[PDB]
Nucleic acid binder design. Structure first.
Lengths: 17, 133
RNA sequence: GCUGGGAUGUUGGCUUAGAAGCAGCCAUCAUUUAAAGAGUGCGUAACAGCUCACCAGC
């Protein structure tokens, strides 16, 4: 339901490092 | 090089598209309008496209024929495949229908004969609880 | 042992946020093949990537 970089269907995913 | 199955005339959503290739360098907006451009000829169906992104973030993409499972679902008039293929049949299609799908997907199939093509399609139907009659 | 290949439907169906050979359940066909599992293990969030089966040359 939340994270950064890490799912397929709601909206987060990734985006730095 | 990314690949996904986007519906005919539709694109841009974050959950479905965006994040996906949007994290490889691709510029969503350009693809959405572009994809939805030629995906006009064939609308309503879910078609798989293979996006390719060059070092300069630019990109191209080939549009293929819709998945077998998809066409099959459509043909059997169902919305989902059996939850337990073979153990529970959730739909069925005529041998002629297999012929239609095999013909439709031919450009993406490697069969040397319409017979081999149908045998391929049948393999998919057998995997989603769809029978042939 | 070494090198190369290990392909197509297809990310199989379901499930799931995702579930793409590899969390889990069901199925495990077909094609093109010299050969290549609806995949042995590692791996990824899922992909990717590595590896094994299998085949070929030496």
């Amino acid at each position: 339901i939340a994270s950064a970089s890490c799912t397929t269907x709601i909206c987060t995913c990734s985006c730095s490092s | 090089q990314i690949k996904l199955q986007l519906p005919a005339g539709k694109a841009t959503p974050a959950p479905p598209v965006g994040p996906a290739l949007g994290q490889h360098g691709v510029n969503i907006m350009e693809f959405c309008k572009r994809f939805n451009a030629e995906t006009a000829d064939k609308a309503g169906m879910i078609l798989p496209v293979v996006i390719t992104v060059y070092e300069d973030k630019s990109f191209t993409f080939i549009i293929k024929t819709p998945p077998a499972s998809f066409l099959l679902k459509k043909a059997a008039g169902i919305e989902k495949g059996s939850s337990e293929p073979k153990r529970k049949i959730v739909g069925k299609v005529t041998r002629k229908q297999i012929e239609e799908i095999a013909k439709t997907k031919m450009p993406d199939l490697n069969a040397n004969s319409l017979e081999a093509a149908m045998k391929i399609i049948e393999g998919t139907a057998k995997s989603m609880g769809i029978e042939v009659v």
